[PDB]
Amino acid sequence: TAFLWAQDRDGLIGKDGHLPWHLPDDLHYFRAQTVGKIMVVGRRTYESFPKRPLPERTNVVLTHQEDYQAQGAVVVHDVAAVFAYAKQHPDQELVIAGGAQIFTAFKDDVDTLLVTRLAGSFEGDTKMIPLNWDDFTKVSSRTVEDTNPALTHTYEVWQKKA
Numbered sequence: 139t140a141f142l143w144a145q146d147r148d149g150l151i152g153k154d155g156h157l158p159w160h161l162p163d164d165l166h167y168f169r170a171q172t173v174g175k176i177m178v179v180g181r182r183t184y185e186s187f188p189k190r191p192l193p194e195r196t197n198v199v200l201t202h203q204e205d206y207q208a209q210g211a212v213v214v215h216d217v218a219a220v221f222a223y224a225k226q227h228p229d230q231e232l233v234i235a236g237g238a239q240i241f242t243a244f245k246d247d248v249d250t251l252l253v254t255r256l257a258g259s260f261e262g263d264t265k266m267i268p269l270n271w272d273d274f275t276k277v278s279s280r281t282v283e284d285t286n287p288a289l290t291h292t293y294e295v296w297q298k299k300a
């Protein structure tokens with residue numbers, strides 16, 4: 139169970155469906171970070187995504203309906219079931235992809251946190267949930283500059299201590 143999202147300096151994520159900042163280098167970070175892993179996206183994000191499902195990537199949708207028809211992409215309606223699959227897959231763990239609703243239900247059960255902090259500052263109404271950074275420790279961090287002052291950003295990966 140890991141969290142994988144992107145936020146600006148204030149900690150924004152996405153406003154009204156489409157993200158607030160257009161960062162091409164971030165999308166690659168999202169795909170590369172979920173290659174061969176289970177991608178949990180709530181019915182709101184999966185419905186807002188641009189190209190679904192991802193190529194050679196495990197994607198799971200979360201919804202409260204019972205007739206959700208999605209051939210090619212996994213489908214579940216209870217975090218309890220999703221937690222089972224990852225425990226049963228020896229090569230596909232549980233990775234969260236959002237949106238905010240999915241970061242809250244899994245906030246208690248977290249194992250790895252992946253956040254992208256951009257240098258630019260955007261505004262909106264939906265932001266990432268309150269994570270306990272004090273209980274986790276960043277094990278890997280990479281900063282990359284870009285021709286655009288705001289499109290600049292860093293990748294932070296954390297792990298839960300025991």
Ligand SMILES: NC(=O)C1=CN([C@@H]2O[C@H](COP(=O)(O)OP(=O)(O)OC[C@H]3O[C@@H](n4cnc5c(N)ncnc54)[C@H](OP(=O)(O)O)[C@@H]3O)[C@@H](O)[C@H]2O)C=CC1
Pocket residue numbers: 142143144145150151152153154155156157179180181182183184186200201202203214215216217235236237238239240241243264
């Ligand atoms: N920074 C980032 O990484 C990401 C950011 N974003 C931004 O966030 C927005 C989405 O945030 P938010 O408004 O919170 O919505 P979400 O996209 O997080 O909504 C998740 C949906 O999943 C379903 N769901 C949630 N919990 C459960 C559960 N326990 N059982 C069953 N179904 C469940 C609900 O759908 P239902 O209506 O079917 O019950 C819920 O509306 C995106 O539009 C985008 O702007 C989106 C993805 C990633």
Ligand SMILES: COc1cc(Cc2c[nH+]c(N)nc2N)cc(OC)c1OC
Pocket residue numbers: 142143144152155156157164165167168169186187188234235236254
């Ligand atoms: C991989 O493509 C998208 C991915 C996301 C979610 C997302 C983005 N970036 C990061 N770092 N984590 C995420 N979960 C949101 C999108 O739009 C809101 C996308 O389409 C541009």
